[PDB]
Ligand binder design. Structure first.
Ligand code: MG
Ligand code: MG
Ligand code: MG
Ligand code: ZN
Ligand code: ZN
Lengths: 622, 616
């Protein structure tokens, strides 16, 4: 793929990439790549075409761009904007697989700056009504097309940008006759046109009159919408008119006239069109065929000469190449003339300064509705406009302000500690704590918060033997299971630890499971909560202070008492929900306990709470 | 032939393509072994080469938890270590363009635990596990199964291609082929990354299922206000904070939450970062496995899993780890959780594990639906869903289109190759700037006339013709201040006075009316491009009109000096004139030659037959 690579790296100053409608069933799509010399011939009669040659293979000779003003050759009048007749000799021609080629095209920002229609929707509606009332309504003819132009500016234009637009069009648009980027030096063209102008192969000429448009809803095409479209009298008349008008042209170019087939629905990305085909036989010279078919009635109107006059009366600007022709003129294997040509609609012309002009119109008929015709022009430019400014470039749903706010709110009224930088983040200063893990690594989190209070910490397991003299305070940790299940070895072992710490008067703080076990040791009932408090933030009164704490428990201790006296222990102060009797925490003579998890991300001010709990536990130490 | 080319051609018996984070895909190949433990991963002693370098890709199965002393249904899945002997990167778009498509339809596609059985398990976990203190959240796996016909790694490459083009918001998208087993997935969740001492985890839970029609802002907001989904995410955050507190001496710092948007769902997630200096093998052992795919507390979760799953997990909830070195010699780890992943055996049997975080307020039917949403992108990558139109091939569209050809002209649909009294009659057709004349000529030739077309302004010798056809054109037939219209008046007056047979169409019909004294009027609704049924001199016909002006009269006959009696075909209600028959001429308002006229050639033939009546 050396030609393609050279077009890509700037080494082919004049080039065309054309993805055509020739491929078959389960074939990969291919892109024709052309390069050669540009010239500006002074008429169609002077296209630089050699005498007949045969190679044994199909071969293209020239790519010709015919502007609207070329109608002077038919003696018709036109606003002359100086758009030249352009011919590119096809000195080189290669084909490349679509997928590989597209992969090699680098993306580029092609957002259209100062994007606007030269004739805005309200002004365009008024023109449409004038054409219907003052042209159709006075006998100029039956249908006409009036161009308006979508305009914008490309920042920092180079043909790389045009290749990027072409790439998007190839990835998104369907139902096109050609998708192309043609760079002539003077100008760049990028488009996705649904309509051949004229083809010729082995004396067989084909035209494709297309009119009637179903605009897809943003949510997509539907069967009800397409059925209502195909039952619409205006849309069906419109197609019949352009069929008649292409039959006229075929009757002039082909001595036995044209034969119609179809109609067919052509489906594109943002709209569908109804179309017919016409075929016939001709042996006229390509130059004469091109001249005599300038330009299709689907993009001017009918009768053709009267349409040129309506067009001139209502368009202030010239048309450039809008409604014109891109024509590949060639030879077949054995030397007969070949023509493949497309109508220049759904196309951007980009000038050397990066200014983009996208011409668009619609077939206006006696029963046209001006507002619907405005909407039809937006539908027709939608795929090319999207190729410049893809709607997926816009902000994601995740960036919507309601989503960002909802996400930020999750962080309000939860633990500050865990959001603080790594490190980052007292009577307790000297203090050594042993944390006994009962098979829940919440312990590691209790240890980090205790360390921030100034304690040195060590973690063991329930089943280990330790020397308690090395510690000032023991933390009895959380864990799974039912605190009443004393025939589980691990739970039984928790009972033995708590009974020993109580009996020794060793300061301790009991968390969740160990809090529950402590309650049972002190004679307070345990019960299963009907709705488990497993992973919930609950506001509680904790010994006269309102706190917001994280719970992970299915079971709870329950009592009517705020204070009790317990044998072998002394007075135990109880913080409880006054409505249910559920126990939140205990303060005893040499210990504290909590049902909730101070260390959880769901506790507000966990370290302070843990500090208060430990401070209480060591109250008898001197 | 680069590495990627060899992978593509079947030349690498073990390979991985991994698209991580101009998107690039990492391509790896080398030697496979199944070490017996994490401690025995074949990792060399440190080297600083001056560039980043990957050493091993490791697949850690669920049963590897025996190394933590936890119990699992042991299915013998190996710890898989692939040495990265070769490592190349290839542009994603280029790579995908080179992968050939292949049929990957899943045969006998079904979940091993069906929706009803899975909803029952969910309720049992909530009532009997969460409800009896086993812990706060758990994940129960079920498996979507199916069979691939004629399996080879080419097929997995085809699945990977589709996942890469359709799935978004993934952490890794991958195909990893070991020889015995292929893994293809698009997981949203890193397991653990380590870069320059910085460890990161990504607790994800809470899922918004997209409607078939697509995500909406109203749907997202209602999801983000759902207390169950919010609690679920907090729980997994706590549980990863535990893990980070064990592997990082100063613990983890939380950032987020963020909404991760995928193709068929979105998740809520947090991140947690901290510093660690542990050996990578110890980091991997101690973090088996994330609480987002097991539950909490972790050991209790392994027991809950074992109580309710009969099958082993394979590599579901396990880890894919790339272990390496940075430029300066420091350890690197990038690892992803194996969810949203297909494991495929040599026979082409596909297993796709999926579960959801069950919590106290879970709804069993919603959890079932959540498992469907999570497998949707992967399942679509095997069996892409139907189009979204094919409108042109819809039977109602095809019928509507075929009906456009009924009750219009036959002539223009006949082969151009194959389509008395008038035989050899010569017609001159005078064009007034509407090439309908070319169509009239074709129809007249089919009747056997010889025809010639000239322009209005030409000088002609009328002796060479038997009949003149005065053609249609634009403009107002009452506008004798237009040179072309004036010239048509002169032609009709000359033909009338010479008694030359003629037939006038549309504009010329109107002018003829004016010359004969019959008023012209402008129609308020123009008859421009419309098929109308008329009575044409006693015969109902269907004909195509293209006119804005029309002649109008109360009379069925008019007597005109210089002419004689002219018979008028008109709408009896409105007086609108359709046609004339005079002593040496006929005329029609409509276009017999149009596609909108039924039996145009016959009508033309009648009109010409009448016109030449005085000749013989
Ligand atoms: Mg006016
Ligand atoms: Mg239209
Ligand atoms: Mg969930
Ligand atoms: Zn708890
Ligand atoms: Zn007419």
């Amino acid at each position: 793929r050396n030609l393609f690579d050279r077009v890509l790296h700037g080494q082919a100053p004049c080039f065309a990439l054309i993805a055509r409608s020739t491929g078959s069933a389960g074939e990969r799509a291919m892109i024709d790549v052309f390069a050669g010399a540009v010239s500006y011939p002074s008429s169609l009669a002077e296209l630089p075409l050699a005498a007949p040659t045969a190679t044994g293979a199909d071969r293209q000779e020239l790519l010709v761009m015919v502007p609207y003003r070329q109608l002077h050759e038919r003696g018709f009048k036109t606003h002359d904007d100086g758009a030249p007749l352009v011919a590119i000799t096809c000195d080189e021609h290669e084909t490349v697989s679509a997928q590989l080629a597209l992969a090699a095209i680098p993306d580029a920002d092609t957002a259209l700056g100062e994007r606007h229609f030269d004739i805005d929707d309200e002004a365009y509606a008024e023109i449409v009504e004038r054409v219907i009332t003052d042209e159709i309504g006075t006998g100029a003819g039956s249908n006409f097309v009036i161009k308006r132009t979508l305009e914008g500016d490309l920042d920092d234009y180079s043909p790389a940008k045009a290749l990027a637009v072409f790439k998007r069009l190839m990835r998104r648009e369907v139902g096109a006759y050609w998708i192309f980027v043609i760079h002539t030096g003077e100008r760049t063209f990028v488009g996705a046109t649904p309509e051949r102008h004229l083809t010729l192969h082995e004396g067989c000429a084909t035209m494709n009159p297309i009119s009637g448009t179903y605009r897809y809803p943003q949510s997509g095409p539907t069967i009800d919408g397409i059925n209502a479209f195909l039952g619409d009298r205006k849309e069906s008349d419109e197609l019949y008119m352009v069929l008649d008008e292409e039959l006229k042209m075929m009757a002039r170019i082909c001595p036995a006239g044209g034969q119609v087939t179809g109609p067919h629905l052509r489906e594109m990305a943002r709209l569908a069109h109804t179309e017919y085909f016409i075929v016939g036989h001709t042996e006229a010279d390509v130059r004469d065929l091109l001249r005599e078919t300038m330009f299709a009635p689907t993009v001017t109107g009918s009768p053709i000469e009267s349409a040129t006059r309506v067009i001139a009366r209502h368009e202030r600007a010239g048309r450039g190449y809008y409604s014109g022709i891109a024509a590949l003129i060639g030879r077949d294997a054995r030397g007969g003339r070949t023509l493949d040509s497309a109508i220049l609609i759904r196309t951007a012309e980009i000038d050397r300064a990066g200014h983009v002009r996208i011409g668009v119109g619609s077939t206006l008929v006696r029963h046209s509705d001006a507002v619907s015709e405005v909407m039809e022009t937006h539908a027709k430019v939608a795929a090319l406009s999207n190729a410049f400014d893809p709607p997926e470039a816009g902000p994601a749903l995740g960036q919507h302000p309601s989503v960002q706010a909802a996400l930020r709110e999750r962080n309000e009224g939860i633990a500050d500690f865990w959001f603080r930088p790594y490190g980052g983040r007292a009577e307790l200063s000297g203090c050594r704590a042993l944390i006994v893990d009962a098979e829940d690594h919440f312990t590691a989190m209790i240890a980090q918060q205790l360390s921030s209070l100034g304690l040195a910490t060590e973690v063991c397991g329930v089943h280990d033997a330790v020397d308690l003299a090395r510690y000032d305070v023991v933390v009895m940790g959380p864990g799974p299971g039912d605190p009443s299940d004393a025939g589980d070895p691990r739970i039984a072992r928790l009972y033995a630890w708590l009974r020993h710490l109580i009996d020794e008067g060793k300061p301790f703080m009991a968390v969740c499971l160990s809090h529950q076990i402590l309650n049972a040791i002190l004679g307070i009932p345990l019960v299963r909560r009907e709705v488990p408090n497993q992973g919930i933030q609950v506001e509680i009164d904790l010994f006269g202070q309102r706190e917001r704490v994280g719970f992970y428990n299915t079971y709870v201790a329950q009592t009517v008492r705020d204070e009790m006296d317990v044998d072998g222990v002394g007075t135990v102060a109880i913080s409880r929900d006054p409505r249910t009797g559920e126990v939140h925490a205990l303060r005893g003579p040499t210990f504290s306990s909590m049902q909730f998890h101070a260390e959880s991300v769901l506790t507000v001010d966990g370290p302070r709470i843990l500090g208060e709990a430990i401070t209480h536990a060591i109250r008898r130490e001197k």
